[PDB]
Amino acid sequence: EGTLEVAMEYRTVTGVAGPLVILDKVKGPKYYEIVNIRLGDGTMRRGQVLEVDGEKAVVQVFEGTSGIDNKFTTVQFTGEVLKTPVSLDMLGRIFNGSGKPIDNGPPILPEAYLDISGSSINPSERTYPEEMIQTGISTIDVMNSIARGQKIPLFSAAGLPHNEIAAQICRQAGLVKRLEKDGEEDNFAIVFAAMGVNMETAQFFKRDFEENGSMERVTLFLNLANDPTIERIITPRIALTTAEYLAYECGKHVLVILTDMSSYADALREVSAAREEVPGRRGYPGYMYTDLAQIYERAGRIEGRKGSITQIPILTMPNDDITHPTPDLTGYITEGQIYIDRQLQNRQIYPPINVLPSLSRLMKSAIGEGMTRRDHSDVSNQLYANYAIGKDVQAMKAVVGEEALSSEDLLYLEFLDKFERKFVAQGAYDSRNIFQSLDLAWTLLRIFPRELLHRIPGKTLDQYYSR
Amino acid sequence: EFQRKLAESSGDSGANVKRLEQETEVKIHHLNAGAEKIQYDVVQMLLKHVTTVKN
Amino acid sequence: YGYVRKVSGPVVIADGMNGAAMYELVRVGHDNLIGEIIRLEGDSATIQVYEETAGLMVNDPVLRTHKPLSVELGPGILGNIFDGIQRPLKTIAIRSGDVYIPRGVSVPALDKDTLWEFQPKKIGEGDLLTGGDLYATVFENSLMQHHVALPPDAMGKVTYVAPAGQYSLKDTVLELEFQGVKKSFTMLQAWPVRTPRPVSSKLAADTPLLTGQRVLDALFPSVLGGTCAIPGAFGCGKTVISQALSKYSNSDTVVYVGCGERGNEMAEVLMDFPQLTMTLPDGREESVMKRTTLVANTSNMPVAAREASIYTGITIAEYFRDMGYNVSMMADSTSRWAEALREISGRLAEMPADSGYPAYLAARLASFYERAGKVKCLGGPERTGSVTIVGAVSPPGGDFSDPVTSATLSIVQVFWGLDKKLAQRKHFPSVNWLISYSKYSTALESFYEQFDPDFINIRTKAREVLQREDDLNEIVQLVGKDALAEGDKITLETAKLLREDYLAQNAFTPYDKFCPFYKSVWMMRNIIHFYNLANQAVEKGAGMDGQKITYTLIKHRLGDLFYRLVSQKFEDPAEGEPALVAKFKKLHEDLTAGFRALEDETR
Amino acid sequence: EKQVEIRKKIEYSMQLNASRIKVLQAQDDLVSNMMEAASKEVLNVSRDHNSYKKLLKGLIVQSLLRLKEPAVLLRCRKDDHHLVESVLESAKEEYAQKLQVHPPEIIVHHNAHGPSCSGGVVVASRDGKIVCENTLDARLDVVFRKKLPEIRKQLVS
């Protein structure tokens, strides 16, 4: 505070293996101190100190390690942790992985520097997700709904249109309370962070956001596949810090779309392997759970502020499974799971969301008579049961023949057909009102007689079984 | 009707562009005035921080 | 004293320790982070930091404390929320206006300035007192008294006991003299987090848990001081069972220590339990926050804090059992705890074992679980109290081959194995009755006999019916119900009725919010009596047909009794036992009228 | 017609983005003017010859205390080299007073050109492995970086 000290500059780069430069004969080395590397050519890269030991210190480099020499490579210890500048002007701009602006504009004029991995929120100050946001997609709205401050990861496999449905959610997300909801603060101020994305996907998201008229609202941090791998382990943290500043300290509802968390697990694997650490499941680092918790638990409404953070981190299973460590840990941590199945895609339904594997822990809070129809929970719990039992019936009929099925079996099969065709499918640009979705669900349910509707209570039946 | 609608849209777009240009000019003027007002104090503070050493 | 050498993740190697014993808590850096020793190599000692390690220097001072991980006990421990290292969260949020938890905050675990009322238990001057003797009682809050006891490592003659009145923890409420020297005692009591509290002798449990849910309390019971394990499932499990064990259980208090779980779920729990007006007393609606305690440590919390959270939770259980209450501790952790062990073991460069988990995982889980069990307390008066450990296991997506699951099942006595298939079908209590078990079924013989001398037989009959139905489900999956005879058909009808009436429960309505034992046993007896009478009728074969013809006869001309049986779940418990018992006795009489009236005209 | 009006809305949004980007770029240009003025003032500070020596002594003391190395090799501009040569052993005496250590064996030769230096010293250690750049131009752009949020907070209007 009194007087400053200009950062030291070294040259003792005694070891360079992969993405790690191993400095030596260093003094006063901070942990996670951000370093500046000036090569012999004069280009400047930026790195981080993964480990400090005695006089040595191991430094990973974001922009790669394609030119370091033991003689000329200068490294400089800034003596501080990462601090991404943040300002209200950060809305409506597109950025590189580490925060450098790529919109041909000027660099951010900061309102303040906020250290990455922001300060932990005391649980005695959080509040449960109260309000519900309308996702447009009917399957999400009727079962597995999303409340403000939720963490819903979309589970997908290679080739499925997870990016398309993410864009649809970004275009269609909005409040639901009594169908009443300018709303500039109600505008979700989407922060999109893409890691390891094919350039076509980045162009697609850019064009969709530009066309939807949200270019003055959304914000993009991109870490393309050709871009250096290490920046993928910083980009989501930068995005979450920016979201935290835009929501908690500015009072804007914020929505976050982390893309290809498997492309983040890959960065974790590369870093862990480069350090010769003890591996975990499938060779992933033993602390992948801690990192995923640190990257997910930074969303949720806060009591003292009017803001909120609701993130939808999409995920790509490697071989289309769940036992893989990354989707498994994500399911452990996150409060939801939306499943996109290859079977539905093979049958050509644009939203391939398999409603049976789906789950939302906070579903019972978002719905209710105060903000939804009183029958919403009943309707959902019945459709789920009939779909599950009908699927069992279809599996049985696959071996016993269509003739051996009973009348209830035929009813269940017809319910499955109309559910997978008329209900799940929805337009790529057409939304569905929550009440319209419930009306469609009731039309699907009324195939069965009143006797078979075991889950639905008679009180809700009287007001809805006829309509 | 369509020709009238497109003509009205073009007129509204031109009006919005002119309003944006005027607002931009006003903003630039305000920022330049503030910078001119506060430049000397800013530079004095910067030099005071630079030109001090402790121990 | 000592200085840092190496900083990698949460593992810090500080040189110059020399005489620094294992698990001797040390304080690291200028920010003064808490931290426990994990390994030694000479003048240097490994430390776990329990906090973010970003910003540690080299030659940054580390101070030793000579004390292992210790949690501060005493009045006011109930109804609070503590971090894994036992920091009062609400105190931090109020004392510092910042909504965040600042790095390296130093706040006492219990407030040292609140005025507490002191009621000495007739202890006279010059009297002799000993470890755990209960010399004074303090009403921490209404409907939950807090006895004050001497620490187990204390004894002496009572030279001075403070009089009744308002006291604070900084004051000396009692004085003792022993072996020619005197010692003082305050209302605080610090205890190492490990090294469980001493017990005069353990005991064999006899009282059941009698939890709210019908399946748990009837099919797979647990005893007070028992040991359970659910697979930490959501929607079901971690929410409905937690609510039942917290607000609808006979345990005198609750200790929720669920760590390593979602932050939104923790906020929901911590915002819903404040109201939670459970009728724990006979005629009072006191909120259960005057009865429970949270040791919440979210997933984003430092990896090294999971074990600390678990052990502080079980230590708090012990303080209450020692006073006399039958505490029941629920741990949504032990799924993230195994991950914490893997992280620390790998970082400490330990050699992994089967499936990568540390070889000593079973030892740690045993050292945790075996602190359960009802126990005859220390000191005077004679007393008894118990601790229940209803832990968590990996969700039903992995088989029992999981090392954490195998280790738990090698120790845990009662397994409430929830199945994901039931969760898909939206069966909300979701206990799979084929794979669950309860080794306590033999000790509860006395209680079952005294409550109802015929419950064991009807329970065995229900188990046989369920097993028979699950057995012939495969045969039906091949051939179909065409070949099913009268006995098979009636068995499947009774199994379906049991599955949808008995084994289900909504828990969001007064019909199934809390099912007392009498109502559940009456449902079981009614269903089993119907099954037995129907089997006898179809075995009679009167009217030259009997059999499945008689089955259709009782399902059509006698189906009103069947509908009343399947609707018996809706008997409102608020009507009281003398009313519901009469209603069920009348239904039983009507059922006995059937299968005799049906046999009157020989079908 | 729908896509025409959608394209018109997109064009309006693009125009709004262009206007706001122009405003932001003008803001950055003003910040650059501020930095240029600060650099000019820093250069003007070198005109002094009495407090300038005290500042140089303070800078060399700070750097030598930060290195805490047995043998540094200070490098100073050819202009005002006389001032450094005059202060000489005063810095060594001050450092030896700071802690019970033998006086460093400083060495002072090649100098960078004035505008590159603009005052300040580069101290470094033997073999140049560890370098401390206490140039005035180096003290600036660090104070600037730290105080930039305060600058924006000062630029309310």
GROMACS .gro file of N, CA, C and O in nm, chain A residues 277-309:
model
  132
  277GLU      N    1   0.173  -3.726  -1.148
  277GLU     CA    2   0.097  -3.747  -1.026
  277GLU      C    3   0.030  -3.883  -1.027
  277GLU      O    4   0.022  -3.951  -1.130
  278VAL      N    5  -0.020  -3.923  -0.911
  278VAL     CA    6  -0.091  -4.051  -0.900
  278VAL      C    7  -0.224  -4.040  -0.975
  278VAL      O    8  -0.302  -3.946  -0.949
  279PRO      N    9  -0.254  -4.130  -1.067
  279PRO     CA   10  -0.379  -4.121  -1.142
  279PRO      C   11  -0.498  -4.173  -1.062
  279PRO      O   12  -0.484  -4.234  -0.956
  280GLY      N   13  -0.617  -4.146  -1.115
  280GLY     CA   14  -0.740  -4.197  -1.057
  280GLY      C   15  -0.811  -4.290  -1.153
  280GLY      O   16  -0.747  -4.373  -1.218
  281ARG      N   17  -0.943  -4.278  -1.163
  281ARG     CA   18  -1.019  -4.362  -1.255
  281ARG      C   19  -0.985  -4.325  -1.398
  281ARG      O   20  -0.984  -4.206  -1.434
  282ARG      N   21  -0.957  -4.426  -1.480
  282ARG     CA   22  -0.921  -4.409  -1.621
  282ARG      C   23  -0.803  -4.313  -1.639
  282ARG      O   24  -0.788  -4.251  -1.744
  283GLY      N   25  -0.718  -4.301  -1.537
  283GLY     CA   26  -0.604  -4.213  -1.547
  283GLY      C   27  -0.632  -4.067  -1.523
  283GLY      O   28  -0.541  -3.985  -1.534
  284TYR      N   29  -0.756  -4.031  -1.492
  284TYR     CA   30  -0.788  -3.893  -1.460
  284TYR      C   31  -0.730  -3.857  -1.324
  284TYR      O   32  -0.709  -3.945  -1.239
  285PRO      N   33  -0.701  -3.729  -1.300
  285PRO     CA   34  -0.643  -3.690  -1.171
  285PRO      C   35  -0.736  -3.723  -1.056
  285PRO      O   36  -0.859  -3.716  -1.068
  286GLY      N   37  -0.676  -3.761  -0.943
  286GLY     CA   38  -0.754  -3.797  -0.826
  286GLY      C   39  -0.840  -3.686  -0.771
  286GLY      O   40  -0.937  -3.713  -0.700
  287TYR      N   41  -0.808  -3.561  -0.804
  287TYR     CA   42  -0.882  -3.446  -0.753
  287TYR      C   43  -0.976  -3.386  -0.857
  287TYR      O   44  -1.014  -3.270  -0.844
  288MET      N   45  -1.013  -3.463  -0.960
  288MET     CA   46  -1.109  -3.411  -1.057
  288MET      C   47  -1.241  -3.375  -0.991
  288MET      O   48  -1.307  -3.279  -1.033
  289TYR      N   49  -1.280  -3.448  -0.887
  289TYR     CA   50  -1.403  -3.415  -0.816
  289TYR      C   51  -1.394  -3.278  -0.752
  289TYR      O   52  -1.491  -3.201  -0.757
  290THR      N   53  -1.280  -3.245  -0.692
  290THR     CA   54  -1.265  -3.114  -0.630
  290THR      C   55  -1.273  -3.003  -0.733
  290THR      O   56  -1.338  -2.900  -0.710
  291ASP      N   57  -1.208  -3.021  -0.849
  291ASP     CA   58  -1.213  -2.919  -0.952
  291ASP      C   59  -1.354  -2.902  -1.007
  291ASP      O   60  -1.400  -2.789  -1.029
  292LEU      N   61  -1.426  -3.013  -1.028
  292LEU     CA   62  -1.562  -3.003  -1.079
  292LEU      C   63  -1.654  -2.937  -0.976
  292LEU      O   64  -1.743  -2.860  -1.013
  293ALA      N   65  -1.634  -2.967  -0.848
  293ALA     CA   66  -1.711  -2.897  -0.746
  293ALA      C   67  -1.680  -2.748  -0.748
  293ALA      O   68  -1.771  -2.665  -0.739
  294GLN      N   69  -1.552  -2.712  -0.761
  294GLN     CA   70  -1.515  -2.571  -0.764
  294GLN      C   71  -1.574  -2.500  -0.885
  294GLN      O   72  -1.604  -2.381  -0.877
  295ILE      N   73  -1.592  -2.571  -0.996
  295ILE     CA   74  -1.643  -2.508  -1.117
  295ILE      C   75  -1.796  -2.509  -1.122
  295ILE      O   76  -1.854  -2.428  -1.195
  296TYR      N   77  -1.862  -2.596  -1.046
  296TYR     CA   78  -2.008  -2.600  -1.048
  296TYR      C   79  -2.073  -2.525  -0.933
  296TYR      O   80  -2.174  -2.458  -0.954
  297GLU      N   81  -2.017  -2.531  -0.812
  297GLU     CA   82  -2.080  -2.475  -0.694
  297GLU      C   83  -2.079  -2.324  -0.691
  297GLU      O   84  -2.112  -2.265  -0.587
  298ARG      N   85  -2.041  -2.258  -0.800
  298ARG     CA   86  -2.039  -2.112  -0.806
  298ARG      C   87  -2.164  -2.056  -0.873
  298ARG      O   88  -2.157  -1.954  -0.941
  299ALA      N   89  -2.278  -2.121  -0.853
  299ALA     CA   90  -2.405  -2.075  -0.907
  299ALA      C   91  -2.514  -2.093  -0.803
  299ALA      O   92  -2.518  -2.195  -0.734
  300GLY      N   93  -2.602  -1.995  -0.793
  300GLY     CA   94  -2.714  -1.999  -0.700
  300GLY      C   95  -2.748  -1.861  -0.648
  300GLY      O   96  -2.663  -1.773  -0.634
  301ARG      N   97  -2.876  -1.841  -0.617
  301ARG     CA   98  -2.921  -1.714  -0.564
  301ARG      C   99  -2.858  -1.688  -0.428
  301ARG      O  100  -2.826  -1.781  -0.353
  302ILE      N  101  -2.841  -1.560  -0.396
  302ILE     CA  102  -2.780  -1.518  -0.270
  302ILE      C  103  -2.876  -1.425  -0.198
  302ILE      O  104  -2.941  -1.341  -0.260
  303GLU      N  105  -2.886  -1.442  -0.066
  303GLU     CA  106  -2.990  -1.374   0.010
  303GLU      C  107  -2.973  -1.222   0.006
  303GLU      O  108  -3.071  -1.149  -0.010
  304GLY      N  109  -2.850  -1.174   0.020
  304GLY     CA  110  -2.829  -1.031   0.033
  304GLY      C  111  -2.838  -0.952  -0.096
  304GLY      O  112  -2.840  -0.828  -0.090
  305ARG      N  113  -2.846  -1.017  -0.211
  305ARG     CA  114  -2.844  -0.949  -0.339
  305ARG      C  115  -2.959  -0.996  -0.425
  305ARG      O  116  -3.010  -1.107  -0.408
  306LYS      N  117  -3.001  -0.911  -0.519
  306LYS     CA  118  -3.112  -0.942  -0.607
  306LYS      C  119  -3.071  -1.024  -0.728
  306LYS      O  120  -3.158  -1.063  -0.807
  307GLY      N  121  -2.943  -1.052  -0.745
  307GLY     CA  122  -2.895  -1.125  -0.860
  307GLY      C  123  -2.920  -1.274  -0.847
  307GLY      O  124  -2.988  -1.323  -0.757
  308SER      N  125  -2.861  -1.348  -0.941
  308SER     CA  126  -2.874  -1.493  -0.946
  308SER      C  127  -2.781  -1.545  -1.055
  308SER      O  128  -2.745  -1.472  -1.148
  309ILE      N  129  -2.743  -1.672  -1.044
  309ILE     CA  130  -2.657  -1.737  -1.142
  309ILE      C  131  -2.714  -1.876  -1.167
  309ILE      O  132  -2.723  -1.957  -1.075
   0.00000   0.00000   0.00000
